[PDB]
Amino acid sequence: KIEEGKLVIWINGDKGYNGLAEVGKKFEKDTGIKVTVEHPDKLEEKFPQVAATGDGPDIIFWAHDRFGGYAQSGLLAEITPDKAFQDKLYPFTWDAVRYNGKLIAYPIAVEALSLIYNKDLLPNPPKTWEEIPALDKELKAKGKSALMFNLQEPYFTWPLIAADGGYAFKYENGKYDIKDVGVDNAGAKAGLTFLVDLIKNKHMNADTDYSIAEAAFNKGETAMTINGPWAWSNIDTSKVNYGVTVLPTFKGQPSKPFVGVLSAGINAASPNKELAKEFLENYLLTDEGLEAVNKDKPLGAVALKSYEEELAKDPRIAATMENAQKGEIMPNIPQMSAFWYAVRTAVINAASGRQTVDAALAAAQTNAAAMATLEKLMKAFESLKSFQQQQQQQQQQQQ
Amino acid sequence: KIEEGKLVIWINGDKGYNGLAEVGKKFEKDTGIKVTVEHPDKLEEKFPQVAATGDGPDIIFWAHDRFGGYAQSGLLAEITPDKAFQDKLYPFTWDAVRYNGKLIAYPIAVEALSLIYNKDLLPNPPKTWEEIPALDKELKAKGKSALMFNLQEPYFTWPLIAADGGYAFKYENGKYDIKDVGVDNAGAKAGLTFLVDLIKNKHMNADTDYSIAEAAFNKGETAMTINGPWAWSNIDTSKVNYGVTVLPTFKGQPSKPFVGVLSAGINAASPNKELAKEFLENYLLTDEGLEAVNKDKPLGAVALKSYEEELAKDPRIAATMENAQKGEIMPNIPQMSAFWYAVRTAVINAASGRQTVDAALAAAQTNAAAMATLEKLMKAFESLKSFQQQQQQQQQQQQQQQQPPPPPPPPPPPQLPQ
Amino acid sequence: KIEEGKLVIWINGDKGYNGLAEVGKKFEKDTGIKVTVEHPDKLEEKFPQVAATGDGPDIIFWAHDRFGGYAQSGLLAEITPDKAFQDKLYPFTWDAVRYNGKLIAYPIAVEALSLIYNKDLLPNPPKTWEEIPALDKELKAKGKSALMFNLQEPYFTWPLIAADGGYAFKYENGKYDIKDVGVDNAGAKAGLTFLVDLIKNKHMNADTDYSIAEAAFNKGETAMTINGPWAWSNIDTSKVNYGVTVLPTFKGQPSKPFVGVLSAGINAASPNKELAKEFLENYLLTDEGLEAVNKDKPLGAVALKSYEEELAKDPRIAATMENAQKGEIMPNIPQMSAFWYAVRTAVINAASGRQTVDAALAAAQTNAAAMATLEKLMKAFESLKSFQ
Ligand SMILES: [Ca+2]
Ligand SMILES: [Ca+2]
Ligand SMILES: [Ca+2]
Ligand SMILES: [Ca+2]
Ligand SMILES: [Ca+2]
Ligand SMILES: [Ca+2]
Ligand SMILES: [Ca+2]
Ligand SMILES: [Ca+2]
Ligand SMILES: [Ca+2]
Ligand SMILES: [Zn+2]
Ligand SMILES: [Zn+2]
Ligand SMILES: [Zn+2]
Ligand SMILES: [Zn+2]
Ligand SMILES: [Zn+2]
Ligand SMILES: [Zn+2]
Ligand SMILES: [Zn+2]
Ligand SMILES: [Zn+2]
Ligand SMILES: [Zn+2]
């Protein structure tokens, strides 16, 4: 079930799949090629199944981080956009769609955390983390908090940790150094120290999660929160005058949040590789192409410099892009699973007073390596099953 | 019992040991040294145990791949042949007897897969893989197949995969790079793709094993087969006019099959190191030395350029050598166990449609590292084996955490002649 | 209970804590900071618990090898002694208090195995291992052995193995190369070969442990033994005229024993970092500071060149230092656990003739690599239990 003489596209239901098939019907009208967009349940899990048997869609739209596993399984074809078309998108977006120095997907939309604040309580958002403590008691006098965001998630607290020098793995020359962790450098240390300090001073709770944080802002109890474009819909409903802006700066350095980029990948088994490249290069990745998908459903910031500038008219979108530019592309490697979990524990321990800043991060940097075990002994499952899946000759002869 | 004033030699039962005894008799008459040659059953298993206790033979003749484990266990003495004697053998053979850039055995005989074809059906064997498809339907018109060989074994299908750039591990400056696998490069990809294509087109069965392939050729149903010098005896009995030649070429590159080289190693515990070096350097590794072993039992191609040229008179032997020269020396490292098994699965999966070439190969690559870690599991078991051996042979809180239960590593078959 | 404006010190109950307290009293008098010295049970285990929670002492005195784990856990603050003060101590001691090229403790006292011999039986100790065999039968004629020391421990047999080129891991640039083991080089090979030969010739038992060796010397049955400064007290009681001297030499190279160095580390959580650095730099690490600790309890050889020269008056101490200088600082890395155990087995197997020198030494190097990551994974599995 490849396709052959047609195109089949998989994207997530929560996206502008309607907006896409419009560019499908716009393509179909020019080439005579039937484009079918479809959105199956947990496709990001179906794809490793079906593509492994040569079946599945011709292209797949998903976050760039998941493609790492696909590319390593050889499930994605290597794209060949000329230099001219490369200059049409933001250079940083191309670093998000590259596995082993080989380009393996077209960047679509950019997603990053930003600083959301209530314009009523706060006419001017602080440009620095260091003025939050001073700001908090100014607000606490009126029975309001300065800032509240999710602390149970590293994804949310990483921007501050990594603001001074912290980094997952090292990106140098289109390659991630799995042996060059940076959750233990002086940068991370100071980052987390500041965050712990706020909790020790009573400027923040140690048990602030997502729901608590969101609710606090939406009721107008807090002055600021940190969240992405997905939380915008909820605030509009709260009817609370809010603006999204660039994140504050720590020790004069800007915050470095993670960057989730939607990408279009081409099946390595798809016989219509030329057509996919046709569809995506000249039909979708154009002003009207993105416009159309965007109309059914907003995509936040986009990779395409031309259409981005038009969307930038929205202060919120412009801030998401600016935050992403200064941020860090989320590594698509498998060792990333490890990092997440190691850092998660490190922050929670440092928050609860179960460990100290210096100490909990130094346990994490070691703990990350300790998840080399994951790979080894998860392969111990896939290997022992296969040695015994090839000894199926016990059931071949009985039938 | 090491020896001391004598030379005890071990060699496999199927080899020319009686021919060796002659070279042991001609050595005895010229120095006065009694030379015993014995062929113990499963000696590749006996040697690990006895040489570890300082006992066993002074020298051992076995395939070069097995010596890797021996050398790493410090079981083999480092040889010192001068540059003059080195030039007497083929330079490529010396790369087969080297562990950690130290020479640890003398090369004897070379073994490699070749292209066997029936001269009756096929007067001229194809010089290229790309003409096999065209050839097959030319033969299928007469109710005959063009080619049939073992597909269940990577050993047999590797020559085509590695023909374009595929390689196990990287050999650069007398060192194998365990972190430089090449079963995933563009070379391998195309190699396997072509092989899969033949099976998808109906030019080959997905379940062709060794017995099926051999039988098909020996009955004269197939035009060609790929096999080594060990299968020659069987074809002579079939009485079917056959010639062995260089393997075909893929994308203009020649096939790169594995090369099994018989070698003479010297026990690190043998006090008669000087005598062994004497025996092998000036007595065995000579025209008349090899001749003698060869007479009791053919050794195929030999390392010695002088005697090789005389044996080359046989078209079959000359082809084995030529195939070996263009081939790849089989790495004697432990990570090789892993490779084999990873590639075996990859080919079989690609052969059925259960995975694609791109998919199965990139899989097997990840899986190769996956084993060079359960290699630890063995020492981890042998860490606890000797720990509980000595802690028997005499006369709370976070303790629960400990969980060293899984897993098991199930062994393989032997394989598999006659 | 961090502290703040006070100084709490931890040191081993067996060491001269009272001497340290004197130094505390002197600090208090000259500043206004009360210094408390306490020696709790199994403190080197307590510390990892309490320091992980930000609690515990401001400084900790323990062997330098244990600090490796502490430093890696980020439990120790990085010290900043100027170059002037660095020149006051022996340069080799500074290589013992360094984790990842960052200095993390002040060296205090140096400990190393030496050659102890009975002056009555042996007026002059042999300067070379190669003359031991000849010496042994000279002594066996009078019903006495030439040498007896612990063979069950690599710690004791390593000086001879490593004397020709053997080495745990490679120290180059202030960094340990975990991939550059040296228990398999020609140096180690010959080392162990000689040791095995002595046992095969009947110059030594394969089952000589610590107790047996010590007793043999103390009764005056053996002419020589190899042991550290901790065994001195026992010999004095034996009342047997003994002298401690530099270890013999193998193939012209000197023996390379391990060097255990007592160090003062500062808690990374201590708010009185400045005061600790004050206490240790200008109060304890001085002639009168060490003197005082030394009086309650001897510390053997000291890092401080000035006070060392004054203690050198004791032939025994001078020999410990000289043995340490030619020896090998014991690596404080985690892969060290592996080495120990790998070598232990290697020696014992080579002792029994269960393996050859070549074979057993090859096994242990490949063994050290196996149990080294699997002590890293036996913790990875272990932590997933504690975190679910
Ligand atoms: Ca173009
Ligand atoms: Ca950057
Ligand atoms: Ca010569
Ligand atoms: Ca080659
Ligand atoms: Ca003062
Ligand atoms: Ca100074
Ligand atoms: Ca004085
Ligand atoms: Ca000196
Ligand atoms: Ca030295
Ligand atoms: Zn859906
Ligand atoms: Zn404050
Ligand atoms: Zn428009
Ligand atoms: Zn036999
Ligand atoms: Zn065809
Ligand atoms: Zn002849
Ligand atoms: Zn006590
Ligand atoms: Zn004398
Ligand atoms: Zn003797």
Give the total number of structural domains in chain B.
2
Ligand showing the shortest atom-to-Cα distance for residue C33:
5
- Gap between the Cα atoms of C308 and B191, Å rounded: 72
- Gap between the Cα atoms of B273 and B270, Å rounded: 6
Residue A114 DSSP code: E
As a residue count, chain B comes to 418
- Gap between the Cα atoms of C119 and C125, Å rounded: 8
What's C174's domain CATH number? 3.40.190.10
3-state secondary structure of A263: strand
Q: What angle do CA B315, B319, B321 make, to 5 degrees?
A: 120
3-state secondary structure of A284: helix
* Among candidate residues A124, A175, A151, the one with its CA nearest the CA of residue A352: A151
* Among candidate residues B271, B262, B261, B263, the one with its CA nearest the CA of residue B56: B271
DSSP secondary structure of C81-97: --HHHHTTB-HHHHTTS
Residues C107, C88 share a domain: yes
Strand boundaries in chain A, DSSP class E: 7-10, 35-38, 59-63, 106-112, 114-118, 170-171, 176-177, 224-227, 242-245, 249-250, 253-254, 258-266, 301-302, 328-329
3-state secondary structure of C122: coil
Ligand showing the shortest atom-to-Cα distance for residue A278:
1
Q: Tell me phi and psi for residue C49, to 5 degrees.
A: -70, -55
Query: For residues B417 and B230, is the Cβ–Cβ distance under 8 A?
Result: yes
Residue A128, Ramachandran bin (φ over 0: left; ψ between -120 and 50: alpha; else beta): beta
Query: For residues A360 and A343, is the Cβ–Cβ distance under 8 A?
Result: no
* Among candidate residues A72, A163, A78, the one with its CA nearest the CA of residue A113: A163
Residues A262, A252 share a domain: no
* Among candidate residues C51, C113, C44, C115, the one with its CA nearest the CA of residue C77: C51
For residue C292, give Cα distances in angstroms to B289, B294, B378, C307: 81, 84, 54, 12
Structural domain boundaries, residue A37: 1-111+258-331
Tracing tokens 């562990």 back to the chain, one arrives at B99
Given an 8 Å threshold on Cβ–Cβ distance, is B408 in contact with A384? Answer: yes
Query: For residues B28 and B243, is the Cβ–Cβ distance under 8 A?
Result: no
Residues B273, B250 share a domain: no
* Among candidate residues B193, B213, B235, B206, the one with its CA nearest the CA of residue B146: B213
Query: For residues A39 and A62, is the Cβ–Cβ distance under 8 A?
Result: no
Please state at what angle helix C357-386 crosses helix C335-352, rounded to 10 degrees.
140
Chains touching A by CB (3 or more pairs below 8 Å) = B, C
Residues B76, B216 share a domain: no
3-state secondary structure of C6: coil
Residues C199, C73 share a domain: no
Strand boundaries in chain C, DSSP class E: 7-10, 35-38, 59-63, 106-112, 114-118, 170-171, 176-177, 224-227, 242-245, 249-250, 253-254, 258-266, 301-302, 328-329
Ligand 8 centroid from CA C289, angstroms: 23
**Distant-in-sequence, close-in-space partners of A225: CB < 8 Å, separation ≥ 6:** A116, A117, A147, A148, A149, A213, A214, A216, A217
Q: Name the residue facing A373 among C54, C75, C380 (closest C-beta).
A: C380
Using a CB cutoff of 5 Å, list residues around ligand 6, an ion: C 82, 84-85
Residues B161, B126 share a domain: yes
Residues A188, A64 share a domain: no
Chains touching B by CB (3 or more pairs below 8 Å) = A, C
HSE value, Cβ hemisphere, 13 Å, CA-based, for A102: 12
For residue B87, with 0-12 CB atoms within 10 Å meaning exposed, 13-18 middle and 19 or more buried, which class applies?
A: exposed
Ligand showing the shortest atom-to-Cα distance for residue A170:
2
3-state secondary structure of A195: helix
Q: Name the residue facing C355 among B53, B379, B403 (closest C-beta).
A: B53
Residues A155, A253 share a domain: yes
* Among candidate residues A83, A51, A47, A59, the one with its CA nearest the CA of residue A8: A59
The secondary element (H helix, E strand) that includes residue B301 is strand B301-302
Residues A90, A52 share a domain: yes
Residues C75, C161 share a domain: no
Residues A239, A105 share a domain: no
For residue B163, which amino acid is it?
A: A
Given an 8 Å threshold on Cβ–Cβ distance, is B379 in contact with C361? Answer: no
Given an 8 Å threshold on Cβ–Cβ distance, is C367 in contact with B383? Answer: yes
Ligand showing the shortest atom-to-Cα distance for residue B86:
3
- Given A331, A359, A382, the domain boundary residue is A331
For residue B21, which amino acid is it?
A: A
Q: Which residues of C touch B75 (CB under 8 A)?
A: 358-359
3-state secondary structure of B232: helix
DSSP secondary structure of B31-83: H---EEEE--TTHHHHHHHHHTTT-S-SEEEEETTTHHHHHHTT-BPPP---H
- Gap between the Cα atoms of B347 and A354, Å rounded: 52
* Among candidate residues C202, C198, C146, C212, the one with its CA nearest the CA of residue C350: C198
Named by the residue before each, gaps in chain C exceeding 2.5 A from C to N are none
Ligand 4 centroid from CA B327, angstroms: 6
What kind of experiment solved this structure?
A: X-ray
Ligand 12 centroid from CA A308, angstroms: 12
For residue A137, which amino acid is it?
A: K
- Gap between the Cα atoms of B380 and B25, Å rounded: 46
* Among candidate residues C166, C169, C196, the one with its CA nearest the CA of residue C183: C166
Chains touching C by CB (3 or more pairs below 8 Å) = A, B
- Gap between the Cα atoms of B154 and B338, Å rounded: 12
DSSP secondary structure of C234-292: HHHHHT--EEEE---EETTEEP--EEEEEEEEEBTT-S-HHHHHHHIIIIISSHHHHHH
As a residue count, chain A comes to 399
3-state secondary structure of C188: helix
Residues A140, A10 share a domain: no
Q: Is C374's Cβ below 8 Å from some Cβ in B? A: yes
The secondary element (H helix, E strand) that includes residue A83 is helix A83-86
Tell me the nearest-neighbour CA distance from C281 into chain A, angstroms. Answer: 24
Give the residue from B178, B267, B376 with the most C CB atoms within 10 Å of its CB, the best one to mutate: B376
Measured from the Cβ of residue A175, the count of other Cβ atoms closer than 10 Å reads 12
Query: For residues C59 and C276, is the Cβ–Cβ distance under 8 A?
Result: yes
Nearest chain A Cα to C54, which residue? Answer: A356
- Given B303, B331, B359, the domain boundary residue is B331
Give the residue from C358, C366, C367 with the most B CB atoms within 10 Å of its CB, the best one to mutate: C358
- Gap between the Cα atoms of B17 and C143, Å rounded: 55
The first and second tokens of residue C64, run together, are 């330098």
Query: For residues C261 and C106, is the Cβ–Cβ distance under 8 A?
Result: no
Q: Name the residue facing A384 among B358, B361, B407 (closest C-beta).
A: B407
**Distant-in-sequence, close-in-space partners of A187: CB < 8 Å, separation ≥ 6:** A162, A163, A164, A165, A166
Q: Is A59's Cβ below 8 Å from some Cβ in B? A: no
Q: Which residues of C touch B402 (CB under 8 A)?
A: 378, 382
Measured from the Cβ of residue A95, the count of other Cβ atoms closer than 10 Å reads 16
Given an 8 Å threshold on Cβ–Cβ distance, is C359 in contact with B404? Answer: no
Give the alpha-carbon dihedral of C268, C270, C275, C278, to 10 degrees: -30
Cβ burial A283-293 (10 Å sphere, 16+ → b, else e): bbbbeebbbbb
- Gap between the Cα atoms of A386 and A389, Å rounded: 4
The first and second tokens of residue C46, run together, are 């307590």
Give the alpha-carbon dihedral of A45, A46, A52, A56, to 10 degrees: -140
Given an 8 Å threshold on Cβ–Cβ distance, is A358 in contact with C387? Answer: no
Given an 8 Å threshold on Cβ–Cβ distance, is B353 in contact with A53? Answer: yes
Given an 8 Å threshold on Cβ–Cβ distance, is A355 in contact with C379? Answer: no
- Gap between the Cα atoms of A94 and A110, Å rounded: 12
Give the alpha-carbon dihedral of A47, A53, A57, A59, to 10 degrees: 70
State the alpha helices, DSSP H only, in B95-244. 132-140, 154-161, 186-201, 210-218, 232-238
- Given C311, C331, C351, the domain boundary residue is C331
Given an 8 Å threshold on Cβ–Cβ distance, is C385 in contact with B403? Answer: yes
